[PDB]
């Protein structure tokens, strides 16, 4: 109906959530998050679409469609986080907010995990809150 | 909505002044209408919250070392504090119960200064970048751990 | 007998036209690729323009100016400040290679200062905006 | 009708008088008041002066002053190298704030080159003594 | 000399135009010829060997994931990638049976942006700078291991 | 008598010693720390006061009136020690010696810790020693 | 008329014992200038105070300026101070690849302050220079 | 006669292009002084050499000195070095926050070697200088 | 007979190799690892000489002669990896190949074991395969 | 004051000067002066003290592997080394008693070279700038651990 | 002839003041010189563009030069890439230990573009450079 | 009455003569000792020259030169870039000690740049081969 579009996207390695650091990263599927959020956003009376990819043009892609249809972006960049200028420089183009979500605490890890080069180019960022941080993303967006 | 899991809400130095404080960036609501509002939220959740903001690190630290004690769980805001106290940080190890760190601004679209936090390897999680509605979101997260 | 010339775009660079007008222009990727054909041919040369977002994509194209000895104008756009893989295919070059940037990346952030390509290709050109790929395609045109 | 100006002295300068004269002088804190508010007087300006080791009463004054449009004199002394909580409240004052260090921080230890404090004020007065006071007293008296 | 555990050879960026690709450091030999002489040497191991490049990191992580579920050790020659592709790294993370990375030429002596590897941390352990051989090195190791 | 006087100061989280990482701190209180303290330096002839603060303001006084009084200080100044140098400028003021005190072994924890920015300006330091440590500095200014 | 001013900073007095000279060169850009329909003129100088006083007159004039600083790119602040009271464009020009030498070649101060920045384009990166300001 | 030498270095002859001129703060500096009771003298150079020189006299006649390096500040030790001779005091003198600017303006290579230092109080820092001097 | 002659020399530890961090280093002793070494180069035939100290002054007296002689050298410099540029400037001297061999992953331990000041100046390096990664140097040096 | 528990102390590079070696640093006492000081000291506390000095560090290697195997706790001023010598470090590494490292300077009010000790992180722990007093309370609480 | 040039910059004609003056270190290079069979010239200047002259004609005459950089040695990239261009030797002198001194002085730019390097050894390591140069 | 030098080499110059003949010439250390001793006899000097790869016998022989007052041309030779035990020797010798480095170290890796003995002694001369040391027999015949 007037339900608003949220657009959920997940880098790399995100394909194998439950396979990973369980005590971390759940043993939640990405299947099983998917349907998750489409459930938890069709609660708040937003329509979410949720997609993965460890393909950099096929997430480029994803978020110039955004940009071009003004859909708010919940993306978790995983590793790309660290170095990816051009997943970076794709989200400058958006237009509605975008918030980056990190499932672990990023900041407890390797210094080489610490710096992301997304967080300044987004609305903002929620880290370590686990799969559960999706579901506080999708909260923003409802009253937004 | 029954109220009953005690949540501690602790804001550090400069919150107080919400309202007045760079409205630019924090907004234009004051500290004592932020209390109000996430106590009338907490409810909603069934979630009994306090708001406590203070200047002095020696009175935060006494509450954050009563939360250990009592095993509450913590939202805090270190604000400046975040770039360098580490007396703060190492007060914060000593809670069992979860911890999220929230900032309002977006700390890494600011400058070089305000872009590390010495508290975020130290508690449960940080949002940063989502205004007031931040802390929202903090207890939402509470409210079904 | 017109001498072949490839000019390469990466990441982005497909949507020249949307944002910052000001820096980039409010030319899309087919008018530039349009205009640089136009250009080389009133200079002699026979101009190809590709665009990607892929970086295996990319890749291929560079490997297959190295063993056509076709030289090449590469705008790498945000790979430049990374992306050593884009940089390990360039070295292969044979014929001259061009590095273009559009914006002055130098006056932007200290993340842009740097370009990881610029130590391996014959020169670089940057912050003369679009019309520097054709000042990539004059210096080829008497190479 | 006197314009009034709150100077404000930071962490360890309560001791003024103690130790390093060569520095810092022979005055106490008290001495330096009184000769601040004479100063100022002469000026046309009603100055007070309060001295304090508390981060939290410095904030307090820092935002009574933001309140009341009170142009400011800070010596944040120590703070100045690293106190963010301090530069947090120093950025919502309205009207001028004039940094002043006694010593020249530039010729010690390289921990004190650096204040977070002046790149949030209007100026920075460092090195030139007590009178650095009077200097910046003398700047707000013509503004 | 009775080729039956599963050993996978994994090529990143450029290796492809091996022979072409400055072979004053890479030598002449095609990456169809280092294919075959892999796969003959481990069959001599009693190994079975597979042997694949791409310059597509889809491609690679995808690889690395099956590895990881088919519990194949792995040989790893990650390139350029080697220098900066954390996504790389945290793929080869998955992996359970052992994993070794391979340089054919000794990183160390190169210029500096070619010293760090942010996959050596992730790996059982690292060959640098002695050829096409070492990627025979590595097959000698997981032979007896 | 004429028994040396000597002020014992604790920074912030001291005051809560025993619940914490006891196989570094010990199970052993503030209350328990003072006790032994006072003990011990009676049995070398000194005169042994020990105060614990999370205040900068308070520490900063407790040392200035130490300046004034030429008492030998011991200072553990705990997690003040990587960065406050309002406390460092307060120690320069001492005239008696000044031992800085670590319960933990600061070298062998995260990088963060590895620095005093108060070692410069004291007599010397003792660290990883545990709570014996403070018996050390005060063992030193018995002879001194 | 379509004035633009060439300013050769500190050594390039020696181009070709350091085979083409500076002669050589004004006399080349000179040329391609008048084909282009540009009015060009070439200066050299190893002085810093001369050099700031030619880009204080462009600004003024609002002339396009065509700069080679050479080893002042790496540090002298005073130059690229100066550069920032240009009017008109102003292209940085660098014979050699300063990226593939020394780490202390990498970095110019002047890149930030000025329209654009050629490099490694031997002496035909003037020409190119020259090109870019012939249709602006 | 209470001399006073006021030192501005290099683009400082550019103020009011770079809406004061640097005659207007020369005159009103000699009459400020004046008023104090100084014998004021400004002087500007793009030359490190002829600046040098300056500083040279002012230590041999020990006379105070009031200096904005302008962009020097930020590398020219021979400046630094120069300063170092004099025997009275030296203010140093920055018009705009140089801490409020981008990192390769906030280190100054002569803070250490002078009195003392006035930054972002504008062209009434000169005056501050002055009364400093005043009273000295 | 015609038999190549190799020489393994071991640094400053590895003397005490067997007594140490047994899941990385192994239970093996140095005489132990060099009756294996002696054995395998046999098997290959190479005549292998395995020698081992903590005297930096014998351990170049051993790369000089090692460089007059031609003999290809497979060294473990193990801490002296990180710092001594004396045994780095006698290892330049050498003429035959010359293999660097870590028994531990380096890159995985501490930050100040990253860097090896030796490895520019050698033919290769091999780290993190254990004892038999001195086995692979020497199958590398049978075919060369 | 009965002597039984052996400990050792150990002096590494340039402390075999002691006396002549930068006296207005570490005083006028000679090594054999210190060494009779810290035995009669140790015997006071029923310490069976040994003292050696050397400026070679392969001797002091041995010395460390011997009290591993021993289990002698060890208080160790590794001098010049601790700025750098990971050989040394890497052997206390495999001391199983204590270890207590001494600096007769307050290392910290020197020269920046001076600020850092790489033995530190491995040892029990650290007293600096205490002088040869310094020995002495590693002794002290030696004698009640 | 054994022509040998010794070259002093920025602030060296004020040594004594800065208790041998600049004209008693030129008078005993001149006399050390002759009693080794070279003929020494020395020269000094505060000016970049003079120093730089001077180099370029060293480089054309194929002279050696014995260089005391002073402050210009940690920073000025301009004389470090004049100095490039000599073909015979060129020795850099320091009286001073520049590394006993402060941080902001320990490198020097010139170092690596010339023979060899004398720090520490006062006005006898100009003697000493003259002694190498007369055996060369 | 001869005055009495200590030349004293550091790790890898007993090699002389082995490499990089354009940097450390053909010679051999025997070859300069007595080159030096022949020399320093020309200049009324009583010279000695010893080398060592083993840093206690190195810092056995500063420990003597210390205790005798003798001035010492040192070529520390790698243990420039790292060895403080060394320095900390060096640190006890009273009369003068000059550091040579036959090499131009400054042109060299940039881990070469870096002398952790030029602090502590009198100077340094670097990259005039085996000249360099006559020249600091020559300073230390007239000091």
């Known amino acids: 109906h007037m339900s608003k579009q949220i657009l959920v996207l997940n880098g790399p390695n995100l394909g194998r959530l439950g396979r990973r650091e369980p005590q971390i990263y759940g043993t939640t599927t990405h299947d099983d998050l998917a349907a998750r959020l489409i459930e938890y956003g069709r609660e708040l009376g937003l329509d979410v679409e949720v997609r993965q990819t460890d393909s950099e043009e096929r997430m480029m892609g994803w978020i ?10 919940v993306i978790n960049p995983a590793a790309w986080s660290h170095y990816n200028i051009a997943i970076a420089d794709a989200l400058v183009q958006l237009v509605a907010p975008c918030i980056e979500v990190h499932i672990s605490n990023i900041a407890a890890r390797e210094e080489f995990r610490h710096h992301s080069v997304v967080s300044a180019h987004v609305t903002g960022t929620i880290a370590g809150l686990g799969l559960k941080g999706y579901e506080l993303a999708l909260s923003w967006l409802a009253t937004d």
């Open 64 to 73: 110039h469609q955004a940009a071009d249809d003004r859909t708010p972006v």
